Design a protein around this ligand. Structure first.
Ligand SMILES: CN1CCN(C(=O)c2ccc(F)c(F)c2)CC1
Ligand SMILES: CN1CCN(C(=O)c2ccc(F)c(F)c2)CC1
Length: 460
């Protein structure tokens, strides 16, 4: 029975509005409704992994698991296994997998982050799950961010707190946050970004939605504009939105957007918005393709519609050679040549690098670099040809070309990371000096760049 090199992943996000779901929610898991929808000819084909995020979820874990599992068994005639379930207040994540994957999944982690302080602490935050699928690390975050049209900056702050403090994946990757710990990271939820148009324009917006003319609305979507300005979700992807705003509906129909201010809303307007979103970030040159992104039309218990997204995702096998794991394979080597980091910092410490990768027996510390001043005010840290030669556990190019090297640049004075990035070993050539590049971030914000050349020796 061969190990897969691709899987498909279902991501759902639904703010349930504190109401029990209707009796049938199968359209959600089938990617049917509005937007980029799934072909009918696929309806019986199970996804490999289903990841369900809810917000304002009124059900117990047991109650929701029974609905989810029996929904999937009805669609697929497969009884899924529960990988993980984690709940913070009314924010929940469920991961379900086909039974054939049970012994391919390991290292399951769960965590949550509570956002805000005093007043603003007690209902918003995030839950997440990570695990290994054979050789591939997968991370999933369901966040419910701060509400309100005039709180985009708070949402951005919530995002940074979640990626800083959510403790998922390999704890040995100590310099790295969740935006670098996984081959594939999916981040979804009620992100609560709004369409920023004047309140007076509510009926105009509704008109546009009824005509399926979303372009003049999406140009004012706060998540797209904040992403464009590099204020949030740096280096993440989102499929094009081709479905109607998913909030705020009158319950029990989808014919009416309920946008006017009420005591129940704190006297706030809720103009129609794409609150409910799926984004992802995968390591460079790993296969990931969005095959659906849309909303259901027939699930109407909430003031939000459910959102679905599905992905093809590249995965790798748990590789064994006669040498590694358990030793190095001297027919393999990774040389980082003529490298330099460009940093936005004003500090004047010396810096060193750490190289982290599951192709190494443990992380590798470099010597300190040589600081120079850049022509436009910057710090340039030069490493020359000084960098340690990295010794992979397995030399086989079928393994090594699928790997990645995480890089942290750390202060000698504090040992704190000033920037993190990732280099793919999916090179155009071996035994050949080739350019490499990564942006560097810290707490998810751009702090610099790392560039130079690589020379990879494999057994072939
Ligand atoms: C509640 N727990 C029970 C223990 N548990 C597993 O045994 C498990 C391991 C791998 C899988 F893929 C899977 F679906 C399940 C995870 C959930
Ligand atoms: C297919 N990908 C390639 C990478 N990518 C961008 O470079 C990007 C361009 C414009 C943006 F507003 C933004 F937020 C990001 C996202 C799309």
């Amino acid at each position: 029975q061969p190990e897969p090199d691709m899987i498909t992943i279902f991501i759902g996000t639904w703010n349930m509005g504190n109401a029990p779901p209707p009796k049938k929610i199968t359209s959600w898991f089938l990617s049917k409704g509005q937007g980029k929808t799934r072909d009918d000819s696929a309806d019986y084909i199970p996804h490999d992994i289903y990841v369900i995020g809810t917000q304002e979820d009124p059900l117990s874990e047991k109650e929701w698991l029974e609905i989810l599992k029996h929904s999937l068994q009805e669609i697929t005639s497969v009884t899924f296994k529960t990988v993980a379930i984690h709940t913070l207040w009314n924010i929940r994540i469920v991961v379900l997998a086909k039974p054939e994957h049970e012994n391919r999944i390991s290292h399951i982690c769960t965590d949550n982050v509570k956002t805000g302080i005093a007043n603003t602490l007690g209902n918003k935050g995030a839950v997440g799950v990570s695990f290994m699928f054979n050789g591939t690390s997968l991370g999933f975050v369901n966040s419910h961010l701060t509400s309100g049209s005039e709180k985009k900056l708070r949402r951005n702050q919530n995002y940074m707190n979640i990626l800083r403090f959510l403790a998922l994946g390999d704890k040995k990757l100590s310099p790295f946050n969740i935006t670098h710990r996984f081959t594939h990271l999916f981040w979804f939820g009620d992100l609560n970004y709004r369409v920023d148009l004047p309140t007076w324009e509510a009926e105009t917006i509704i008109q546009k939605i009824k005509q399926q003319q979303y372009a003049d609305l999406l140009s004012h979507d706060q998540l797209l504009t904040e992403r464009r300005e590099q204020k949030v979700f740096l280096h993440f992807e989102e499929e094009e939105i081709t479905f109607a705003p998913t909030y705020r509906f009158e319950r029990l129909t989808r014919d009416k957007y309920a946008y006017t201010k009420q005591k129940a809303t704190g006297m706030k307007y809720n103009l129609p918005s794409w609150c409910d979103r799926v984004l992802w970030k995968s390591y460079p040159l790993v296969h990931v393709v969005c095959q659906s992104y849309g909303s259901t039309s027939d699930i109407m218990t909430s003031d939000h519609s459910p959102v679905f997204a599905t992905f093809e995702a590249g995965v790798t096998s748990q590789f064994v050679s006669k040498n590694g794991p358990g030793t190095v394979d001297s027919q393999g080597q990774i040389e980082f040549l003529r490298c330099y980091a460009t940093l936005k910092t004003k500090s004047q410490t010396k810096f060193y690098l750490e190289f982290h990768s599951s192709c190494l027996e443990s992380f590798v510390k470099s010597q300190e670099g040589e600081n120079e001043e850049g022509s436009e005010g910057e710090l340039v840290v030069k490493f020359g040809e000084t960098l340690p030669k990295l010794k992979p556990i397995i030399s086989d190019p079928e393994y090594l070309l699928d790997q990645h090297i995480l890089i942290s640049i750390k202060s000698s004075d504090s040992d704190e990371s000033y920037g993190e990035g990732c280099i793919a070993l999916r090179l155009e050539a071996t035994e050949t000096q080739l350019p490499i590049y990564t942006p560097l971030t810290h707490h998810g914000e751009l702090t610099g760049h790392f560039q130079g050349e690589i020379k990879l020796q494999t057994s072939q």
